[PDB]
Each structure stands twice: as C-alpha cells, then as structure tokens.
Design an enzyme around this catalytic site. Structure first.
Site, mmCIF file in Angstrom:
data_model
loop_
_atom_site.group_PDB
_atom_site.id
_atom_site.type_symbol
_atom_site.label_atom_id
_atom_site.label_comp_id
_atom_site.label_asym_id
_atom_site.label_seq_id
_atom_site.Cartn_x
_atom_site.Cartn_y
_atom_site.Cartn_z
ATOM 1 N N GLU B 420 61.974 67.487 54.068
ATOM 2 C CA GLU B 420 61.661 68.833 54.565
ATOM 3 C C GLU B 420 62.920 69.693 54.686
ATOM 4 O O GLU B 420 63.229 70.248 55.737
ATOM 5 C CB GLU B 420 60.921 68.763 55.897
ATOM 6 C CG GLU B 420 59.590 68.019 55.865
ATOM 7 C CD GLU B 420 58.439 68.917 55.484
ATOM 8 O OE1 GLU B 420 58.589 69.706 54.528
ATOM 9 O OE2 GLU B 420 57.381 68.842 56.134
ATOM 10 N N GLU B 496 54.086 60.580 52.463
ATOM 11 C CA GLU B 496 53.292 60.675 53.681
ATOM 12 C C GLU B 496 51.852 60.985 53.302
ATOM 13 O O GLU B 496 51.599 61.932 52.549
ATOM 14 C CB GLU B 496 53.840 61.756 54.630
ATOM 15 C CG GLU B 496 55.335 61.623 54.958
ATOM 16 C CD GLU B 496 55.884 62.844 55.653
ATOM 17 O OE1 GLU B 496 57.089 63.124 55.514
ATOM 18 O OE2 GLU B 496 55.098 63.533 56.329
#
Ligand SMILES: O=[N+]([O-])c1ccccc1O[C@@H]1O[C@H](CO)[C@H](O)[C@H](O)[C@H]1O
Ligand SMILES: O=[N+]([O-])c1ccccc1O[C@@H]1O[C@H](CO)[C@H](O)[C@H](O)[C@H]1O
Ligand code: NA
Ligand code: NA
Lengths: 988, 988
Positions: B420, B496
């Site tokens: 991220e 994820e």
C-alpha cells in the site's frame, strides 16, 4: 371455525372510517346565558395497555372500582405519570396499515360523579372540547356516542338520560385509532381529555347556533351586519342589540350601519352585542372587516396587509396539551410586545377560548383544521387518507366542526384545510364545503402546489430566491395553463419560514426586504412560536427540558420538537429578539450628521399618533443629551424627515475624533395598551461615531531570555511551545487558532443542493476541524524601538491525516503597559477533503485562562448574541453581564453567545480585569471548553472546569436555517483564505 | 534575529530523509561461533513527551539518574504503562506534512549497564534487531549512530569505544520521525526497542556475510550449491562442509551435487552445513530449491504450487510487538495443523528467528520490506515518499537490509517491495536493486497494478469473478501494449483475500475452486492470521480484548485491528476451522452407496504414504462399524477409487429407511511429524443417510377454552396475544417471527457497487427490521381428527412508519405427546425503502423461554457454527455442548452461533428437555436477547437475563466479506419472499 380472540369489538370501532356516532350537529362555541356546570376537577382513571385486556367489568357505573386513581381532567395523561410522552416528527409510531391500530394502545378509563340541579332539566347536553384521540362516552351506563377529531368539539344530548341529583359520567379514551392516521402533526403524542368538559342546560326557545356577518365598506365607511340565529337547525326569531352603534335589528336581515370603525390587528375595534330570544341570550364581540383578493394581493378593508406571523402550537412543559389561560394571555401579550400581528394555529384549531383573545388583542389568524397525513409521503402517498373515498365523511366532518366552532370571530381571516396531507379528493371536498358554508374567508392549503382548491398560493421554507421570483410573479408556470393562470393571480404567503431551531434563525432580513418590496408577497409565519420542551427533574433536583427519545421511545426525532422563538416556559430565545426588530412596523434611519432621521410608517392602517419619539446620546460614561421630538403623524405607507434638536448635531460635531458615542432614536408607546405599558419599545434606529483604531504599543521593552521561559513586558512565554503562559499574572494555559465551533442545529442539517449531502457538521468532522493541532516552526526576537524588540512565534495549524494547513505568525510588542498582538494566517495547501471544499466556522483565537471569569463587559452590539446573518436585534452600545448570562440556555447545548462587531472588552478575573481592544472582533466567553459543549446533549452535561475560554474571532460564519430550509447564504459563508488582524491587550 | 526555540537539533535529525548514520553494512543474520552477550534484561527508562523538553542532562553516562525506572528490553513500551497503544488503520495519527514530526512525540530514554569480558576484544559490535521508530545510540557517552527502518537490523562497530569490564549503553528512542511516513501499516503504533539487543565479538579472520545458493535440477535431481562468504565486503577463503552429502568444497565456487532431496513446504528437507575460516565458523541449514516462472505459472522445483497462505503480523496481547519464541513455534505448528503451507510477512520482515522456523516446519514465505505509505492515498498520492527522489536513499536502504538479512533461507520464495505504497521511482529503484542482488527469487508488489517492476501479478480482495477472468487470462488489457504483454505472462497471486473480520469469512469455497481449476492462479493469503486484541483487565477482574479507541485515541479505527483467523492468544475462530477444510490437501468424495470413495491427491510433491485412511459409521447411539483401509500411494495430482470394506456398504443397505447414519472417511497422520502427533486429521469426507421427515402429530386433542387462556394439549395460549405461554410447563414469554440479526462486521461494511452505499446494517435500521411489531388478526379452532382440533393464529408483522409487512399464520395440532407447528409467511406490500429493496437476514422464529438452558444437543452440522457461505469445516454428526460454548467470543459481539442444516435439537432446561424436530433449520441458543448482543461493544456488555433465546431459522443470509472486499454472493443473499415450514416439538 368460530373466532376466539379477545376484544374484537372495541378494535373494530377504533378502526372505523366513520366520524363519531350520535352527537349533535356541529355549531359555534357561544357565550350563552344558559346555565353551565363545568365537570372539570379530579376524575378517576384506570389505564389498560390495549383493547384486548381493557376490562368490561361495568366500571362505567361507578361502583366497586378496582384499579382507579385520582387524575385531573382536563389532562394529557402521560404528563401525570401514566405512560410517557412520545415524540415523532413525520414518522408514525406504529405500522402504517390504515385503518388498523397496534396491539400496544393505551386505553384510559375516565370516570366522574357530578350533581345535576333543576337548572339542567328537562333538557341539557354534555360538551367535550377535546379528546385525543378516540373517546367513548356513557352517562349512567348509557352510551352517548364516540368522538373523532382530537382537537374538535363534540356535544351529546343527555335529555332523558341525565337524572336529577347525582349522575356518573364515564369516558373510555384510546390513544391510537384510525384517526391517528390523520393526526400526524410534528409534536408530542399525548392522549387524554385535554380540553374542558361541560354540562350545559338547553332551555326551550333557545339559540343553538349563531352566524355573525360583519363586513366593512372601505369607500363609504359603512358596517354591513347580519347576525343569523338558529335552533335545531332552523332560522329562529331573535333580536340583535349592539348598543354602541345605536341599533336594534332582527336576526336574519342584512343592514348597513352608516359608519363603523373597522377591525384590524393594528386597531382591533370590537362592538359588544347580544342576540337573544325567549329562553336564551348570546353575547358577541363584533369586528367589522372584509377580506378580499384583488390585483394578486391579500387585502383587508381595502388595504394590502403584511403578515408578521408565527405558528402557535398548544403546548405546556408540565401539562402537555393543556395550556392554562393565564399562560395564553401571557404568551399572546408577549407576541404583541415583539411586533407580531398574525398567528397560524399549526395544525389544529386551538382551545375555544383562544379565539376571543385574538379578536381582542389583535392578530390576523389562520384557523387550521385538524388534518395531517405526513407519514404517508415516504411511501409515495400510497394509501393516503386525503384521497381514500372511505375517509371523505371523516374529513369533511373535521372541516365542518373546525369552521362551525370559530366562524364568528373577526380575527380569523383564512380557513386552512390542514397541513402536510398530500393532494386528494377529500381535500377538494373540504374546500368545496368551506366555500359554500363561509364565502367570507379565503382558503389556505400548502400541500397541493397546483393551488387548485385554494385562494392563496402557500409554501413552506421557499428560498429567498424563489420568493423574489414569486414576488415578481415569474415563477415557472404550472403545467396546466388554466391552473397556472389562477395561481398567478393569487397572493403568496409563507406559512412556515426561517426555521428557528437552536441558534438562529439566519436570513430573516433578506426575506423581510422582499415582503416590503413586493405586494403579492403577503408575509410569513415563523416556524415556530415555542419549543415543546418537557421539564425533567433530575436526582440532584436540577431542572432541564427533555425532548424526543429522552422518554423511552423506540422511534423518535430527538430535539426537533424544540425549534421555537421561545422556550416551553415562554422565555425568549435570541431569535425572538432579532425577529422583533426585523418585523418592526416603523423604520428609523438616523442621519449620519445627527441632524434628524427619516421615519417610514410601515403599518397598514394606523398612523404614528400612538408613539412617543425619544432620542438619547450615549457616550462612554453615561448619557450626554436626550429627550423627545414631536412628529406630526404620518399616514400608513408615508414618510417624513423629522428634525432632531440642534444640540444633538452640535454634540456630534464637537466630539474629539475617535471618541465613541451612539445616537439612538426610539419609538415607544405613548400610553398603555391592552398588551404593554407606556414606554414599551416598538421601533428604533441609530447612528454611531466609532472609536478610532487602537494605537499599537511602542516596542520599547525587550525580550528577556531565561533557559525555560521568555519574558516580554507583562507576558510570559514558554520556550518549548512559543505561546504565552501568563499576562500580568493571569495564567494562560493555551493559546491557538480556531476554525471550528460546536455545531448548531442548522449545522446538523443537510443543506439540499450541492453534491455534498453531508451536513456541515459532518463536513467538519471528516475534515478534522474539531481536532486541530499546532506545530511550532520558529521563535525570534527582532529589532524593535529604542532597545526593545518584537517577538515572532511561527506555527502551522492542521489536523491528523490531513495535508492542508494554515501558517499562523504571532507577533508581540510591548511598552510595559499594553501588549500588542498581530496575527497573520496564510493557507498552505488546497483545503479540499472527500472531494468538497472545506468551509470554516471562524477565523479566531482561543485563550484558555487559568482562572474563572465573573463578569464580561464590551462595546459593540448587544446585549444578546449576534452572528453575521442574525443579530438585527442587537444594537450598538455598552453592555456588561455576569458570565452565566452571556450563555444561551438552548435545550441541546451548541454554539451560541458570540457578540459580533465588538470593539473593546473587559473580563473581570478575580481581582484583575483583562482589556482587549482592536478592530471589529466577535467576543465569546464561556466557563467550559468547546468539546464539552459539543458532547453535551442536555444542559446538565455542561460543567465548569474552573478556567475561562476566551474567543476573539476576526471572521465568522452565518448560522442559516439548514435544519429545515435554506442554509447560510452566500454572503455569509466563510471559505478558507488568508487573513490579518491586530489586537491590543492590557491587565489592570 | 536569532532563533530561540528549544530542541531544534533533535527535531532536524528526526525529520531527516537520510537513512541511519554510521552503522556497518547490511548483512545476513548468521549463526556464528563467535561469542555473543545478549544485553536483554531489565533496562532503565525515562519518558519525555517531546524533543523540545527531552533533557540533555548527560543521562547517557549512567550517573545521577533522575526520573528513570525499571523497564524490560525488548519491549513495546506502551504495553508497560508508559503511554498507551494507539490504533489507526490508514489514517496517520499526525498532520501529513512530510518530513515533519508533531510536537507531541514520546521520547523514550533507554539505559543499561553491562560487563564486557576479554572475549569481546579487540573487536566487537552492538546489534539492534528492531527499534520503532528512530533511535540514537551511545556507548559510554560516545555517539554510535542512528537507526531507521523499525523492523530492520542495525549493527555498530564499538571497537575502540567498548572498554573492558563495565560499559554503559544509552539509546534515545523517538516514536515518530520522518520514517513514520513510510511505516503506516494497519496495526498498533507501539514504539520501543522491541527486538533483541546483542553484543557480538568480531575475531580476526572471521566471516561477516554469507550468501547461500542452493538450487535444484528437477530433470536430473542434482543439487547446485555455491556458498559465498565475505569479510569487510571482500570474498574470503572459507571451507564449506555439508556432512550428509559427502562434500567438502571452497566457498565461492558452484558445484553440482549429483542427487539431493529437494526442499518444499510439504517436504522441507534441510541439510546441515557449516562454512568456516580461521576465526569464525557459521552454521547453515540448506534447502535445495529453484523458483521459476514459465507458462504464466509460479513453479518450484519444476511443479506449479498452490499457495495456501495467511498474512502473519507480529503481535502479542500483552507485549505488543514482542512475540515470545514459544508463542512463535506454537502459532506456526497451529498453522500446519490447519493445512496452511504459505506465509506473508505483512508488512515488514519478522523477527530474525522466524526465518529458520519457516525453513524447518515448511512454508513458502513472502518476505516483505518495511515500507507502506497508505495514508497518502486520500490526497491523490500527493507528496508520496515512494516517488519523492529525496527518499530513494532511505527506501533502497530498507530493501537492502530486508534482502540481506534473510537471503539465505530456502523458505523465502518472493521478495516484496512493501505494501500500500502507491507507484513511484523509489519502488522501481527498490526492484532494480533486488533483481541485481538476488536474481533467484521473483519480486512481489501489489500497489502498481501495471506490474511494471514485479514478476507476479498481485491483487487484494479481487472478486471471485475477476479472479476467474484472470485465471483464464482474459482480464481487460493494460493501456500499454508492452506492459500488458508482460503482465499477461505472469502468474497471479492474491496477497490478501477473504477478509476474516468477525463472523466469516464467507465465499472461500468459490475462490478455492478457481485456484484448482486455473494454473495461472497461484492461490492466496487470508487477511489475516491473528487479531491484534490487547487484553484489558477490568475492575471486577474480568479479562477481554480492547481495540482502537479503547485506549484514548483522538483518531482511531475501532475494531478493524481484530480481523483474524485466531485471536490474540491464538485461540481459533470458526474461520480457521472452515479455512482448514477448504484448503485441505486431499479431497475424499465418499460414494452414495458406501462402497468406496474417490481420493484426489492435491499436494504438489508428496504422495499419500504419510496418511492413514480411517473410516467410521456413526448411528444415533455410538459407532456401528469402523477401521482402516490400505491405499496404494497416489502421486501428486492423481486420483484413485479406493474400495471400502463390504461390511460398510451392507450396513447402509440394511438401514431401516429414515434412520440416520453417517459414514466418515478420515485421512490422518500415520506417524508424528514436526508439527502434529500421529492421528491428526488432515482431510475428510462423508456420506449421509438422512432421517425421514418428522411425522406430524395426529390432531386428536381438542382446544379447551378458558376466558383468559386457551389450552391445546401441552401448550398454553394467551387469548389476548395468540401466542403460547407454556409448553409442558416450560414458560414461553414471547414467540414471533425474526427477519433480522445483530449485524456482523461485514454487515457494517459498505458493499461497493450498487447505488446503495449504505452498509447492510444501515439498510436494516432504515427499514426497521430490528424493531418489528406484530398485530393479531384472528384466532380459530378448526375441525381436526376424532374430536380434536387445529389452532390457527393469524398475525401480521411489520414496523412503525412502514407499509410493507408479512402475514404469519401459526397452526398448531396436538395428540398429547408431540406438538405440531406449521408456519406460513406471505409478503404483503413491496418490501422497498429509501429506494432500495430490503433484504432479510433470516426467515425464522424466536422463542423466548422463561428458564435458563444448561445444554444444547442437535443432529446436523457441527460442532462449530455454520452459515450458508461458511461452515465447510462443520461436518454431519451428533453434537452436544454447554450453552456458553455454543457462543463465539468475538471481541465486538455480533451475530454468531447458528448451527445450520440442523435436523433435530434438544435443550436441557433445568429438569425437562425440549425437543425440536423438522426439516432443515438453523439452530441458535443464547442466554441474552438480540438487542443486548447488538448494543454490546465488548464481551463484558453481554449479561444473561435468566431466560433462553431459541432461534429456529428456515432460511438464512450468508455472511460474505463486505468489511473488506466482496459481500454475500448472489446465491446466498436472502430477498423477501413467501415461505412455508413445519416443526414438531416435544417436552420430556
Ligand atoms: O416540509 N418539508 O419539506 C419538511 C422537510 C423535512 C422536515 C420537515 C418538513 O416539514 C415541516 O417541518 C416543520 C419543522 O420541523 C414542521 O414540522 C412542519 O409542520 C412541517 O410542515
Ligand atoms: O485495499 N484496499 O482497497 C483497502 C480498502 C479499505 C480498507 C483497507 C484496504 O487495504 C487493506 O485492508 C486490510 C484489512 O483491513 C489491511 O489493512 C491491508 O494491509 C490493506 O492493504
Ligand atoms: Na419541529
Ligand atoms: Na485490519
């Protein structure tokens, strides 16, 4: 298969589309010489939670009572410990399946024993002036009937059932019924017998109904009088005596009184009169007035009037819907005292007694039928009773009873079919019936914008912009050419505007300007007159108002029931003070040179002869000059220039420049009136010689450097933070920039328009304005004057996870006596967030002082709060209050108490006082922090923490009315920007 | 103008874009025979709240300490009473103005005294394996340097500064720094020295860095070995001994071992080895494995592997970031015990010790550099450090240290640039450096979807649909033709997926099907392995986990930190149980006739020889038949049909129809493994002979009519409500329809797509599902059988201010022994609201019983909860638990504990037990009401009220994973509809 459920019978009556059973015809409430016995007093009461377990045990007799208890009647019974108030705004508190009632439905059994003398024989009736919401009535166990229309009157013939001596009257009252579906006002659900119960004898040869018709010919000055009288529905012989006008005439005939003094709300002339027959005389007040619509204006007695109105609900903080008569004449004299001249009975007819007081004191009233089906909107008005032919009978009965009761009162100038009820066949039948029964008053109803079945065009909360378009009759045209032509010819009224919830309402002046400029605009009625706060005694014993939810509701609408110009106990909110000045009936423009002032008479009928015109010049210490000036009376809608005594102008000219002084010309009551003592202030105006800007101190004193602190004259800085720690002994715990305030009710509302659907309060939380943080960037001394030095503290203010910021540079200079403080703010980064620009509440400073403040004094506006789009009622002067009376006791606490346009200010802290001067700033002083005020949901949640929160604002937002209608207007919105501002402080 | 602010020097170091100062080169963490002294123990600690008032009083010496106190090191210091944990997800806890640090910035002064013997001379170094977030280090008051990269290792040459005997080591630790801007993981902000401190002697002629290269030639079976060794950065002479493979070779040369047993996570073969020179020997485990990408697949040792992975954070409920080694080998053996074979070190390298355990126990790991700049997204990645050339040096240093430390471990199969962090020049420099330094592992980074600087295509929470499009390589093409061609050739991994917050995660099976069907799909890593609950001891002394906000934060993200398959103490949530069965490495399809079963080996390398194949037949009372069957080993990705003993099939055939029995074939561990004892269950499968439907009772008993109650056999009705009041003495306080449940975490999430942006939980509140109400319509008896009668109770269920409804008709029959209950539901009105259809949680009944329940037993799925899109781990059987172990101890309590597919059920209430039978229903039994469970924010807010809440559901919603990613899938959504269902009850 036979049915085994309990109570199927009561429930089928409760679910009935029909109007009550077995009562006498609807008639006017009349002052009659027939004997009357008020059954008001202390009744017996038993409360069952549903019709399925309401006992049928012959309680109606009065014998062997089990489970009753003393209760007052009239009462709203959840105000006396039986259940609780329940507040819902538009949402129904039960499943919407008309006409069905929920299983949980309080049944209240009522019982009283009374004595009936021979006066009440052979003929009498019982009269219930209000039963919320469905009653069944027995006299000596004999069914009299049922009541429908909770704020309507019902009468029952007890001839042959009322016995001589002792009788037992029993009423069973269900809170919910099919009628609930049509009584969905935005108010408390409170059941019970809340209005008078009365026994009245009906002698033979009496009068049952009277219909007064008292018009006025404004070209000749004639009265036009015809008093109809009737018994059992037939025109009867009766004699009409109005002493004062020297006439005796027969009821039933129209006559032309040669010259009458007309009735208006400015001059409410009432001729006493009686109509009588053999067995009964009836007293009347008679106001000669004629309502008409021409040239798209609403005219009374030939002149276009302006409606300065409010919406009066019937509410009392401890008695619910029961409003004591002393409270009524008090609140109505309050209204006159604030220049109000109109009332709308949102959203039901009031207590019968109310009408005569509007006749006497002077109000144009809109008398509104008890009808409202708001809760049906959310389903696209599916199943709406206003269009269900099964309700025609029920609804026409509500209109008939409404009209019949009050048709005789000159103060009612409009019938209103109801409110927030959609469009529908039944509404049109209500209109059709009313035009037939009483052609003398025009018909109001807002909910059908097409305006097919009304005579005035009526809206709620239409924006100031749309109101100007309508004022010029250029609103977009209706789809139907024929309809559009009609509506364009009606005058326009705002039955609800400038929503006065919490801090506000802002934008009143903009609306008023349009009312004066445009004749087709009739005016407007503020929403609303009072808050519906219900007092709640805490364990401590502190009092405070509760609102929706506080009483255990499963669905509720919070503090939306507290949205008025006065609180439940009629204590004025600052909105009333502002509104009074806005709607003031004369305007006094005081000339700059103080030689005279222009006076415009804004009344429609009266001249100025009622008013003493006083003036005063106030300087720093006391008054310099004052007195009275004689104004030759000016006609309505005329203007003169009236000279002031030459001493006043000479005084202004001889003022040393920069010395403040204020010239106030007041217009007060020359003599007592029915509503105020002589000297009461009606209108005012001012001219101000301002103070000059404050002299910045000479920076002669230098900056002393300790390892841990700095010192520059009387101010002590912390070298770690850069902020002052004390000024002249006064502990300074924090000093920073403010951009936020604890949101008002309007800030909690969604402002429609703009792709930003979040309320401003939410915008702020998302942006982080409530949780700002300050980073220190630098600290310097710098060359001052003769050894002295300035101090510059550089900071940047921002918020966690945010890139935008503001740089704040605090610059201090001192001479030893006065501290100088220049503050500069510059934007760093685009103040954008979640896609929408951020708006600031303010651009100011927050000083947190270590000691309590006892007393606040200032020069500027006052005495009550002021914000950019409010504050009209605040005048220029010198004020001084104790800290606790700087606050505003709103029920949900919120941002309030700012005194805008302030020039100087002194806070008395223990022994010393702190004196701020500077260019116009907005002062605010509270004993608790902003975050304490924001978290607080009621006033007891505010606790002083022993410090002082000093707010000095260089810029402020308006407050608007976004909780219902327009938000802050463009000219008052506060967008982020660079700013510069100078202060000077001083401790003594 | 000279500057007078305090602490300007520390702050300019903290705000530095540069990497640490003055440490030795980054190197591997090595097992060396050099002497080492762990400075771990009990240090001295002083905490200052900012650099501006952090004392410079020569604390670094160890003399005249003022304000210190005993603290453990390693520690996360807010876990020991100094400040508090603070949890933020994406939001930064400070103003975003890189590289600046807020004024409020805990400074933690650390000090220890240690003894240095002659082993540590003339040359030694100090080693800090982790300092969050910026440390400054002094040995005997002499500055060693500074550390950057909180989960990276730093080493400092103390030669000439470390004295003989007693030394004083001082470290100053600032919580926030410029590095904070690049360490914005979704976890607790916990500062301190959380990893080992160590003194290590550095003898002459030693080894500083070793680089193992152990590949595998899958066509010939050869090992390819070359162990590089270096001192002061130069290749040195060293000898490489791997006993077991019969080789001695020189470091620096590549050799071809003729035949090695390769390393994988299924078979983690480790050859022990040492490389040594004159002054130093180093021990190594060596796994021969080769990673490659071909035909768009991720291959290890020539075979496409499937990643059954989780995301391991480093967290411990009382120690914060310090994870005790016993807890590490426990949680890792837990993982193997649930069929996991991969781990991703979200989002930083783990403790150095972790790597060897992944080598030994067997996991494909993704080793992720400590880099994450998530908080910059909200500003459109303005000022993002991944693209600021001023950070290149800082970020490349994070990658180097990351790679260097762990390059020697066969278990790491991917380097990950971080997480991220946007796209940017620095990320590309991190990739460029890594490909150069270590070409043997491919490069992972999700945040640049173009996949320019990576070797695998990686996404988070991509929907099951998009994953099927990628599985077939038909995802929409990248704008750049050249880039798109590259990405289409990479394999695809979900780093994820199936977000396991609260009740869930739903939809795992749909994802797994795609992993098996499509070779380009590599698999996925569940988010996440554990919850970050922090234990909180209450006044009572009850324990419970706290989450974001509970510790006083000004900005926080609530319970989003508790989103894992196990709780902080590694107690499994039902999601782990489900996931284990989903990712199970063999599939056992048991034949309907019970003659055999199909076995597919889903492993990539091992055969089945490790597994005992047991079977059992369970009937009502005990087991009927059982044993073992011998399976000739099946290769990876091969299938056989294995016969079961004929007794099993004959038993099924001879069952009286409608007698339940379950055949379970298990595959368990034949012998102990490094991670589980023999007999541990790996994979299973079942075939069920169901029970027949339950016989409705004959309605022979009639309905007895009292005035207040009805009676029909053992059930007592209330004539006012229609609902049962008792059944066989068991008090029934309420009985009604349910359509709602206390929202799960996914229900609190916004499901993207659809113009409905509200979370399902909000949809429900707006619709009123949580506050339903029941009106009674009718009650009848009806002709039954031989005098007896049915009872039909008609109701309508709905909600206040709502027009939609459901009619519910309860129909009871009884013979005296068993009660029969048929329930019919029909929609009345469109179930629309605020413009969007309403969806139901369930279609069931809620029985509220007047007495407590001690024990719940059922036949159906179990033993743990099951919902339509979960429950894979729940098998068919007979279960029985105490009430308190029917619940699920989620940190924010919520809907859980439903046992779906249930056929029969017994609740033991004091002395009697209540037996429900019927067609498949979902059973749930709690000691508190749904509204108690919804309002509860922590587990102590749940209090038993002495009753029993029995939930029998005929339909249920799935749970989905809407808190992050896909919501409930179409096949599992529950739209309103008519329904019919039969129950039979019985009390003994
Ligand atoms: O008229 N409206 O469009 C409208 C929109 C939102 C909320 C209330 C509302 O109607 C208005 O609200 C006011 C003040 O709260 C009163 O309840 C009034 O009776 C009602 O007509
Ligand atoms: O990746 N996302 O688009 C995204 C959207 C909303 C919230 C988190 C989020 O990112 C993901 O969230 C998970 C679980 O909470 C972890 O924090 C993970 O590190 C993060 O990448
Ligand atoms: Na209101
Ligand atoms: Na999370």
């Amino acid at each position: 298969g036979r049915s085994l459920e309990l109570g199927a019978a009561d429930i089928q009556d409760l679910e009935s589309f029909e109007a009550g059973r077995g009562a006498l015809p609807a008639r006017a409430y009349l002052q009659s010489d027939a004997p009357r016995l008020s059954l008001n007093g202390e009744w017996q009461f038993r409360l069952s939670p549903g019709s399925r377990v309401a006992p049928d045990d012959g309680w109606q007799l009065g014998e062997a009572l089990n489970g009753f208890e003393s209760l007052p009647v009239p009462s709203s019974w959840p105000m006396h410990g039986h259940g609780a108030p329940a507040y819902t705004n538009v949402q129904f508190p039960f499943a919407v399946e008309p006409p069905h009632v929920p299983e949980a439905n309080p049944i209240g059994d009522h019982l009283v024993v009374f004595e009936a003398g021979p006066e009440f024989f052979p003929h009498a009736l019982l009269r219930f002036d209000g039963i919320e919401s469905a009653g069944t009535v027995w006299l000596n166990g004999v069914e009299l009937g049922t009541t429908r229309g909770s704020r309507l009157a019902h009468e029952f013939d007890v001839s042959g059932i009322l016995e001589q001596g002792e009788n037992t009257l029993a009423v069973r009252v269900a809170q919910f019924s099919a009628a609930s579906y049509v009584e969905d006002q935005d108010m408390w659900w409170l059941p019970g017998i809340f209005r008078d119960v009365t026994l009245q004898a009906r002698p033979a040869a009496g009068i049952d109904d009277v219909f007064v018709h008292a018009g006025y010919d404004h070209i000749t000055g004639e009265g036009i009088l015809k008093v109809e009288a009737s018994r059992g529905g037939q025109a009867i012989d009766a004699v009409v005596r109005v002493p004062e006008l020297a006439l005796e005439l027969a009821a039933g005939t129209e006559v032309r009184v040669p010259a009458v003094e007309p009735w208006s709300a400015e001059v409410p002339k009432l001729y006493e009169a009686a109509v009588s027959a053999a067995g009964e005389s009836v007293a009347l007040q008679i106001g000669f007035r004629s309502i008409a619509i021409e040239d798209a204006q609403f005219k009374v007695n030939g002149r276009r009037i302006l409606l300065r109105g409010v919406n009066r609900h019937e509410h009392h903080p401890r008695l619910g819907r029961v409003v004591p008569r002393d409270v009524v004449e008090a609140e109505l004299r309050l209204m006159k005292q604030h220049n109000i001249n109109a009332i709308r009975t949102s959203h039901y007819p009031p207590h019968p007694q109310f009408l005569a007081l509007a006749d006497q004191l002077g109000f144009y009233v809109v008398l509104e039928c008890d009808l409202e089906t708001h809760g049906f909107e959310s389903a696209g008005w599916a199943q709406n009773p206003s269009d269900d032919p099964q309700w025609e009978d029920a609804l026409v009965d509500r209109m008939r009873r409404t009209v019949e009761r009050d048709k005789n009162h000159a103060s009612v100038v409009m019938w209103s079919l109801g409110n927030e009820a959609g469009t529908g066949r039944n509404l049109a039948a209500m209109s059709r019936w009313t035009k037939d029964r009483d052609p003398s008053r025009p018909i109001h109803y807002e909910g059908d914008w097409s305006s097919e079945h009304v005579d005035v065009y009526s809206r709620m909360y239409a924006s100031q912009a749309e109101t100007a378009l309508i004022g010029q009759g250029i609103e977009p045209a209706l789809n139907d050419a024929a309809l559009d032509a009609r509506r364009r010819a009606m005058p326009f009224v705002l039955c609800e505007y400038v929503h006065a919830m919490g801090n506000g309402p802002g934008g009143m002046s903009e609306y008023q300007a349009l009312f004066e400029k445009y004749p087709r605009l009739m005016g407007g009625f503020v929403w609303e007159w009072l808050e519906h706060g219900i007092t709640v005694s805490t364990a401590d014993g502190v009092d405070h108002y509760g609102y929706g939810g506080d009483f255990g509701e499963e669905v509720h609408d919070g503090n939306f029931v507290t949205d008025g110009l006065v609180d439940a106990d009629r204590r004025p909110r600052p909105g009333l003070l502002d509104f009074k000045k806005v709607i003031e009936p004369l305007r006094i423009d005081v000339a700059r040179d103080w030689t005279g002032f222009t006076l415009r008479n804004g009344q429609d009928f009266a001249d100025t002869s009622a008013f003493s015109f006083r003036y005063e010049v106030e300087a720093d210490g006391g008054a310099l000059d004052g007195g009275t000036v004689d104004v030759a009376p000016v006609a309505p809608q005329s203007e003169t220039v009236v000279e002031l005594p030459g001493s006043v102008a000479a005084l202004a000219a001889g003022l040393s420049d920069g010395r403040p002084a204020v010239l106030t010309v007041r217009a007060v009551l020359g003599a007592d009136s029915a509503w105020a003592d002589a000297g009461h202030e009606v209108a005012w105006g001012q001219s101000v010689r301002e103070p000059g800007a404050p002299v910045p101190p000479a920076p002669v004193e230098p900056v002393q450097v300790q390892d841990s602190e700095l010192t520059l004259g009387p101010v002590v800085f912390s070298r770690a933070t850069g902020m002052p720690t004390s000024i002249g002994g006064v502990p300074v715990e924090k000093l920073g920039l403010t951009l936020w305030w604890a949101p008002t009710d309007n800030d909690l509302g969604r402002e429609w328009g703009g792709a930003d659907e979040r309320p401003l309060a939410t915008q702020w939380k998302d942006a982080g304005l409530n949780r700002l943080h300050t980073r220190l960037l630098g600290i310097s001394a710098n060359p001052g004057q003769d050894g002295g030095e300035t101090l510059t503290v550089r900071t940047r203010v921002s918020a966690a996870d945010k890139q935008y910021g503001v740089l704040v540079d605090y610059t201090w200079s001192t001479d030893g006596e006065t501290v100088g403080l220049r503050t500069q703010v510059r934007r760093d980064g685009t103040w954008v967030n979640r896609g929408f620009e951020v708006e600031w509440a303010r651009i100011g400073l927050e000083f947190v002082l270590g000691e309590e403040t006892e007393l606040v004094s200032w020069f500027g506006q006052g005495p009550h709060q002021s914000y950019p789009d409010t504050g009209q009622g605040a005048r220029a002067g010198w004020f001084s209050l104790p800290l606790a009376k700087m606050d505003v006791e709103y029920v949900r606490p919120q941002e309030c108490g700012a005194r805008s346009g302030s020039r100087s200010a002194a806070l008395q802290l223990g022994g010393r006082t702190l004196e701020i001067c500077g260019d116009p700033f907005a002062l605010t002083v509270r004993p608790y922090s902003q975050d304490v005020l924001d978290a607080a949901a009621h006033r007891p949640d505010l606790k002083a923490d022993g410090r002082t929160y000093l707010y000095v604002d260089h810029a402020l937002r308006g407050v608007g009315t976004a909780a219902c209608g327009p938000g802050v207007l463009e000219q008052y919105r506060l967008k982020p920007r660079d700013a510069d501002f100078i202060l000077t402080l001083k401790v003594r």
